[PDB]
Amino acid sequence: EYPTVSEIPVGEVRLYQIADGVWSHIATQSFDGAVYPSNGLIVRDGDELLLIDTAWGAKNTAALLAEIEKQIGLPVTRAVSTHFHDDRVGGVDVLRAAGVATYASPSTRRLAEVEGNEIPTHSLEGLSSSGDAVRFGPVELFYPGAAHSTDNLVVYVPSASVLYGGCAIYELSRTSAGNVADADLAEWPTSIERIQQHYPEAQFVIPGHGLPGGLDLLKHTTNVVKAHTN
Ligand SMILES: O=C(O)c1cccc2c1C(=O)N(Cc1c(F)cccc1Cl)C2
Ligand SMILES: [Zn+2]
Ligand SMILES: [Zn+2]
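Structure for Metallo-beta-lactamase VIM-2, as requested:
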């Protein structure tokens, strides 16, 4: 069973096998007077691992690295953060200290700095216009356009048909819009249309927070966003 928020103490990290060579990582953090769960991705990259997103802070990200070593035992050599919020970049300094080369788009890096969050080291080229895609080892990085944030990226693992939607995609049980302070509500449905057009064969869809599903999460998110606007 996919681990839920009440099952993970703050400071612990779980790994969940999605497909051969693909895991999600699940952590929890104090936020908005509560504790929330948060997902990232781990993808086998030959003899190394590619990490998608931190585990929401330095302490959790240290626990993530320890759990990866215990359960997988291959080195994390690169990480990509999919937008500038702290659930995506908080912990990049720990990753760097562990030998991980950390990456994000130039926009994400600038936005993180202004927000006071940690800053991935390296800039990803080729992702500045909506619909841009680039290969990054065993994944494709895709910029669908503004949605939950202006900089949000999605990640596709072609060998496993896994679409990591990040925070632009809501889990099914989230039926009202969450944090829209950094969102583009008018563009978000169109950005989801771009994701659907690009990845119609996705078999697993991972949201930034909560339970994985399938491509049904895309239409669900569109419906939630539009209901907020209407
Ligand atoms: O999108 C959501 O509604 C959502 C749901 C669960 C958890 C989070 C968000 C969200 O927007 N986070 C960003 C954030 C923030 F906005 C302010 C301070 C710190 C941070 Cl990590 C965290
Ligand atoms: Zn966010
Ligand atoms: Zn988020």
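The chain has six helices and twelve strands.
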